[PDB]
Amino acid sequence: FLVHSGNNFGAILSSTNVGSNTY
Amino acid sequence: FLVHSGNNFGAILSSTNVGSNTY
Amino acid sequence: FLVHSGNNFGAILSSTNVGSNTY
Amino acid sequence: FLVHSGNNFGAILSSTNVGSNTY
Amino acid sequence: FLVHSGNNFGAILSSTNVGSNTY
Amino acid sequence: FLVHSGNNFGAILSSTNVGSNTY
Amino acid sequence: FLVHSGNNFGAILSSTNVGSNTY
Amino acid sequence: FLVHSGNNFGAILSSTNVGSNTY
Amino acid sequence: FLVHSGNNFGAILSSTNVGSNTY
Amino acid sequence: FLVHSGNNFGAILSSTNVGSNTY
Amino acid sequence: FLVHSGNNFGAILSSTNVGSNTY
Amino acid sequence: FLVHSGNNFGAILSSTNVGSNTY
Amino acid sequence: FLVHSGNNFGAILSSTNVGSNTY
Amino acid sequence: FLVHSGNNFGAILSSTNVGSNTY
Amino acid sequence: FLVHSGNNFGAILSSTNVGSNTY
Amino acid sequence: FLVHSGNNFGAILSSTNVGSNTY
Amino acid sequence: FLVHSGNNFGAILSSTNVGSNTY
Amino acid sequence: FLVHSGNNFGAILSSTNVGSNTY
């Protein structure tokens, strides 16, 4: 698994998920 | 598992999760 | 498991979790 | 398990958790 | 288990936990 | 278990815990 | 400006205003 | 500016205003 | 500016204003 | 500026204002 | 500036103002 | 500036102002 | 002999065996 | 012989065996 | 012989055996 | 012989055996 | 013979055997 | 013979056997 984020100026986000029964 | 974040100026976040029965 | 965060200027965060029955 | 945080200027945090029955 | 934090200027924190029945 | 903190200038903290029945 | 990201709402009943509102 | 990230609300009943509001 | 990150609210009843509010 | 990070609220009843408020 | 990090509130009833407030 | 870190409040009833307040 | 009379079940999720069983 | 009369169950989650059982 | 009369159960989570059982 | 009459259970979590049991 | 009449249980967590039991 | 009448239990946590038991 990998996530990464280069230089920005403003709002950013990552709600990435995995798995079952998240409900 | 890996996460990482380069230079920024402003709001950023990562709610990445994994696993079951999160409900 | 790994997390890491390079130079920034402002708000950042990581609510990354794993496991079951989080409810 | 590992966590780490390079030079910053401002607010940062990590609420990373693992385990079950967090409720 | 490991945690670590390099030079900063301002607010930082780590509420990382593990274990069950946290309630 | 390990925790550690390099040179800083300002507020930092670690509420890292482990174990059950924390309630 | 606002964000409403990443929510998981497992169950809701008889409720008002559970989401991002402004102005 | 605000964020509403990462919430898990397992159950809610008979409630008002459970999310990000402004101005 | 504010953040509402990482919350887990297991159960809530008959309540007002459980989330990030401003101005 | 404020943060509301990492909370776990297991159960709440008949309550007002359980989250980050400002101005 | 303030932080509201890491709280675990197991149970709450009939209460006011349990979280980070300012100005 | 203030912090509200690491609290565990097992049970609370009929209460006011249990968290970080300022100005 | 048994009876299962008069029930009102407002909401149910992810459940087993909510009704009259025997032998 | 048994009875299961008059119940009102407002909300239920992730549960086993909420009703009249015998032998 | 038993009775299970008149119950009001406002909310229930993650529970076993909340009702009339015998033999 | 037993009775389970008149109960009001406002909220319950993570519990076993909250009702009338016999033999 | 027994009775379980008139109870009001406002909140309960993580509990066993809160009701009328026999033989 | 026994009675369990009139109880008001405002809050209970992590408990065993709070009600009328016999034989």
Biggest sheet character of chain A: none
- Give the DSSP E fraction of chain A (strand runs of 2 or more residues): 5-15%
Instruction: Work out the helix count of chain A.
Output: 0
Note the gap between the termini of chain A: 22 Å
Largest interface: A-B, 23 and 23 residues
The secondary structure category of chain A is little secondary structure
Oligomer: homo-oligomer of 18 chains
Helix content of chain A: under 10%
Give the number of DSSP strands of chain A: 1
**Strand and helix order of chain A:** E
Could you say which overall geometry of chain A the principal axes of the C-alpha atoms support?
elongated
Whole-number radius of gyration of chain A?
12 Å
Family (chains A, B, C, D, E, F, G, H, I, J, K, L, M, N, O, P, Q, R): Belongs to the calcitonin family.
Protein name (chains A, B, C, D, E, F, G, H, I, J, K, L, M, N, O, P, Q, R): Islet amyloid polypeptide
Subunit structure (chains A, B, C, D, E, F, G, H, I, J, K, L, M, N, O, P, Q, R): Can form homodimers. Interacts with IDE and INS. Interaction with INS inhibits homodimerization and fibril formation.
Subcellular location (chains A, B, C, D, E, F, G, H, I, J, K, L, M, N, O, P, Q, R): Secreted
What would you say this structure looks like, in words?
Chains A, B, C, D, E, F, G, H, I, J, K, L, M, N, O, P, Q, R: This is Islet amyloid polypeptide. Chains A, B, C, D, E, F, G, H, I, J, K, L, M, N, O, P, Q, R: It comes from Homo sapiens (Human). Chains A, B, C, D, E, F, G, H, I, J, K, L, M, N, O, P, Q, R: Belongs to the calcitonin family. Chains A, B, C, D, E, F, G, H, I, J, K, L, M, N, O, P, Q, R: Can form homodimers. Interacts with IDE and INS. Interaction with INS inhibits homodimerization and fibril formation. The first copy, chain A, has 23 residues and is mostly loops. Helix content of chain A is 0%, strand content 9%. The first copy, chain A, is built from no helices and 1 strand.
